[PDB]
Structure 1
Amino acid sequence: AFGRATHAVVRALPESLGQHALRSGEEVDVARAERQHQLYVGVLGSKLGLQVVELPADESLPDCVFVEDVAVVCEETALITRPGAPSRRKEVDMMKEALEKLQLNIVEMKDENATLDGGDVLFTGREFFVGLSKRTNQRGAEILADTFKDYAVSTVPVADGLHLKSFCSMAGPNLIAIGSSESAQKALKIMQQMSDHRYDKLTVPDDIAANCIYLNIPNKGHVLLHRTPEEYPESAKVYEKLKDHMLIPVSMSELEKVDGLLTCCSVLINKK
């Protein structure tokens, strides 16, 4: 019933990430990013009971750590994306291998005109929302709908160099964690006109902290992976009011420099 998952698929980050990972100041501490990453990996694996499929790092692919961009998974059908950046399209080769070893329904985005980034796809359990930016185009959302037939797909424009989940994420069933800046409050109002259902809102002052990770572990509660108070204290105050969720402060300050967030580093899978 939304949020249930049994497997997580991640990928180690390479040394190429420090100097050659795409971004939109301050250099990246490669050692710290991989310390924050394994702790991130430890929470999905040894903490929340999921088994984490760790994928080896490819030094020719600086952004290989952000596996969400190359796969959108729903129920028993996984969509292999064609990323917006041509240099990221080879990240999908090992992604397809691993997801196959899990025996999912594999739909590859092969249209030479299709580009879709997994960070631009916000799935609410009832329908999809696809950000329209330079990474995800119109037709790129049209294979997403063609892939997942039983869900409505509505597209929302994303300005600047952002993804859709750069300022928003699901913090619960029918609950949408939203940022407070002007671009997020604009994309949120647009999405609620297309949906015939009324969604809830968890407004946080920091757009980066609006990207969380919601999980539903049976008899364990509703788990929320949010940004630590050291990273964003004003936004961690909001998540602290949720006394009925298992709150876990996860740090991602290094990978945030290359526009990498909590959601983008793992592909969550329910296999039953």
Structure 2
Amino acid sequence: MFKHIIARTPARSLVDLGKPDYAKALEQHNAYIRALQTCDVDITLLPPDERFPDSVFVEDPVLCTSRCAIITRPGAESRRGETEIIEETVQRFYPGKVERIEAPGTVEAGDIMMVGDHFYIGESARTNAEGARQMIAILEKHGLSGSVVRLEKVLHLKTGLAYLEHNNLLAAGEFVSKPEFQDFNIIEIPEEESYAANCIWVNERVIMPAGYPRTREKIARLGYRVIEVDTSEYRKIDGGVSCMSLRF
């Protein structure tokens, strides 16, 4: 289970299915935090940084494992500098246990799904081959393991996948019939609620976007305490609940 959460207040420059309204987005992020506030974890909420409109999505700049933290290197050049404004926080939680991705390799942790000590890395336009290769090398160095998953009609691996532990895996789109995931209790996500495929397990609680009944029902019947939070302003920019925090 998890003990720590890291998140970052969204910047006003975030606004630059429509553009997000700052005030509205600020409230949804607050509700997101408050929900996490009930999951028996502490929350380290970082200050907004107007220089990085997308810095609110702290999932990408780093991959926090149980044995080490790995500073990534975003594909988006405008997000690349987000690793430097989070290094110190990571350092404080992982003294002498920090690793990193070096150029020309690129990695965004949003393309990585943790399942026990194995990590599935989606090779995308944001995470190149060299990036995934480096990550896998570091993981296998610390007794962990990793493998690459080619993605076709998806930007981030975690956009259509979410492991909820106990072998339960929410899958949408191209992921439902992939050989690598055939052994998981796959819960297919209807194309109509494909957004809800992005959910986060947090100490037996499952925080999901508000407005997706079928999936919600499915998760509830599985034995999870469901907590739904409205993240409609973040949907407008391909952001889900897994994107807005680091969990370890």
TM-score relative to the length of structure 2: 0.92
Alignment partner of 1:30 is 2:22:
yes
Aligned-pair CA distance for 1:210 = 1.1
User: Which among 10, 15, 31 is matched to residue 12 of structure 2?
Assistant: 15
Q: Deviations over 1:167-202 (max 9, x none)?
A: 0111123211112x3x2325xx14237xxxx32212
Q: Is the 8 A contact 1:156 1:190 kept in 2?
A: no
Residue 116 of structure 2 aligns to a residue whose secondary structure is coil
CA distance in 2, matches of 1:26, 1:50: 34
Gaps of 5+ in 2: none
Per the alignment, residue 186 of structure 2 pairs with: 201
Per the alignment, residue 241 of structure 2 pairs with: 262
Q: Is the 8 A contact 2:69 2:94 kept in 1?
A: no
Per the alignment, residue 128 of structure 1 pairs with: 119
Alignment partner of 1:226 is 2:202:
no
Per the alignment, residue 166 of structure 1 pairs with: 159
CA distance in 1, matches of 2:21, 2:138: 38
Residue 113 of structure 2 aligns to a residue whose secondary structure is strand
Q: Deviations over 1:207-229 (max 9, x none)?
A: 2111111122xxxxx2111222x
Q: Deviations over 1:128-176 (max 9, x none)?
A: 1111110001111111112111233221112245100000111123211
User: Which among 192, 204, 221 is matched to residue 241 of structure 1?
Assistant: 221
Q: Is the 8 A contact 1:128 1:154 kept in 2?
A: yes
Divergent runs of 4+, >4 A: none
Aligned-pair CA distance for 1:204 = 2.2
Residue 156 of structure 1 aligns to a residue whose secondary structure is strand
Report percent identity of matched pairs.
30
Aligned-pair CA distance for 1:241 = 2.1
Per the alignment, residue 22 of structure 1 pairs with: none
Gaps of 5+ in 1: 20-24, 217-221
Residue 27 of structure 1 aligns to a residue whose secondary structure is coil
Aligned-pair CA distance for 1:122 = 0.8
Matches within 5 A, 1:41-80: 41-45=33-37, 47-80=38-71
The aligned amino acid for 1:72 is L
TM-score relative to the length of structure 1: 0.84
Matches within 5 A, 1:93-104: 93-104=84-95
CA distance in 1, matches of 2:22, 2:167: 37
Residue 62 of structure 1 aligns to a residue whose secondary structure is coil
CA distance in 1, matches of 2:100, 2:79: 15
Q: Is the 8 A contact 2:63 2:70 kept in 1?
A: yes
The aligned amino acid for 2:237 is V
Higher deviation after alignment, 62-71 or 93-102 = 93-102
Q: Is the 8 A contact 1:178 1:201 kept in 2?
A: yes
Per the alignment, residue 32 of structure 2 pairs with: 40
Matches within 5 A, 1:180-195: 181=173, 183-186=174-177, 189-192=178-181
CA distance in 2, matches of 1:232, 1:109: 36
The aligned amino acid for 2:11 is P
The aligned amino acid for 2:198 is N
Alignment partner of 1:210 is 2:210:
no
Q: Is the 8 A contact 2:209 2:228 kept in 1?
A: yes
Q: Is the 8 A contact 2:61 2:73 kept in 1?
A: yes
Q: Is the 8 A contact 2:216 2:226 kept in 1?
A: no
Alignment partner of 1:156 is 2:149:
yes
CA distance in 2, matches of 1:232, 1:223: 17
